[PDB]
Design a binder for this molecule. Structure first.
Ligand SMILES: Nc1ncnc2c1ncn2[C@@H]1O[C@H](COP(=O)(O)OP(=O)(O)O)[C@@H](O)[C@H]1O
Length: 320
């Protein structure tokens, strides 16, 4: 009890470079740990956990990354949240997530930005100093063909060569590729009033053009994220209020939102175009702004429990 297991692990982790979570059973309950931050998207969470279990059981090729995934579906429904959460659970921190925006690698000479200029990179140096990391490639269809070839090398041998010719090890990484292809086209067809078979057939040809079977066969799983239900959005709202409540808890102030108040923020904080991205500024504008005035005015004080309900002209604040 005096010297804990984390005490020993942190010594070993410092000398070896292996993260504490890897050194320290918990893979059996990996899905419930990811669900603490990621609401819904059960299929994506199952797929990720299953792949990680195959790797650790010694069932997969050792000369490859831990796992590789393609995440399809719309914007703002949990793709990045899962990647960040995966990094925190597996590698102890969100700093262990490396993000590559492929919109910045569309113009031919972008390969030198990835692996470094010729004798005359961002990804290579990043992974060199963090072997244990989650790498997120966003908007993968935007990538230049030559840039796309470098990604296939990582999938094929779990390593990568840079400018000098020296290798960078990718065997301890998790690769997540994300794309939005098809989702805007569906919204276009629904607004234009196309029948279903029109929308369905047009999505498959667009996916066919960009994602060929030679590429997809290298991946562990292809997962399509779905839009969030009204129930699930209410859970996001409750998660997003966490930091505010912790700030208010220092002055012993409670925020009891009524059921209609959560629906108010949920209706404005979510839409099919941007997903739940607008929610942060909706909370800031509709809740945090008028609450700040109440506190500054002297209506809300130390120890007061506040009821948040909805009338016309936005949210109303009441005290017992
Ligand atoms: N499944 C989810 N679980 C928890 N929060 C979510 C979920 N989906 C969306 N959000 C919230 O909405 C925001 C959407 O951003 P993000 O997930 O980064 O979008 P994308 O996945 O398109 O990159 C997040 O910051 C998060 O707070």
């Amino acid at each position: 009890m005096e010297v804990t297991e984390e005490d020993i692990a942190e010594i070993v982790s410092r000398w070896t470079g292996i993260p504490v979570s890897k050194l320290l059973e918990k893979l059996l309950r990996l899905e419930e740990e990811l669900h603490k931050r990621v609401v819904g998207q059960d299929e994506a969470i199952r797929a990720v956990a299953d792949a990680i279990r195959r790797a650790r059981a010694g069932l997969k090729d050792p000369n490859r990354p831990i796992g590789s995934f393609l995440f399809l579906g719309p914007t703002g429904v949990g793709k990045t949240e899962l990647a960040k959460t995966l990094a925190a659970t597996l590698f102890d921190t969100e700093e262990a997530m490396i993000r590559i925006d492929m919109t910045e690698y569309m113009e031919k000479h972008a390969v030198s930005r990835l692996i470094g200029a010729p004798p005359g990179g961002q990804l290579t140096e990043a992974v060199r100093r963090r072997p244990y990391s989650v790498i997120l490639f966003d908007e993968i269809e935007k990538a230049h063909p030559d840039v796309f070839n470098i990604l296939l090398q990582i999938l094929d041998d779990g390593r990568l060569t840079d400018s000098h010719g020296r290798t960078v090890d990718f065997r301890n990484t998790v690769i997540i590729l994300t794309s939005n292809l098809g989702s805007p086209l569906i919204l276009e067809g629904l607004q234009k009033g196309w029948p279903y078979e029109r929308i369905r057939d047009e999505v498959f040809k667009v996916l066919q053009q960009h994602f060929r079977p030679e590429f997809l066969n290298r991946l562990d799983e292809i997962v399509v994220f779905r839009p969030l239900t009204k129930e699930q959005i209410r859970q996001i709202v409750e998660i997003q209020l966490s930091y505010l409540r912790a700030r208010l808890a220092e002055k012993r102030i409670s925020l009891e939102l009524t059921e209609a108040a959560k629906d108010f923020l949920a209706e404005r904080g979510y839409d099919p175009v941007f997903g739940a991205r607008p929610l942060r500024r909706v909370i800031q504008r509709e809740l945090e702004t008028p609450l700040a005035q109440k506190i500054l005015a002297g209506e809300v004080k130390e120890g007061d429990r506040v009821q948040v309900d909805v009338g016309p002209a936005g949210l109303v604040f009441a005290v017992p």
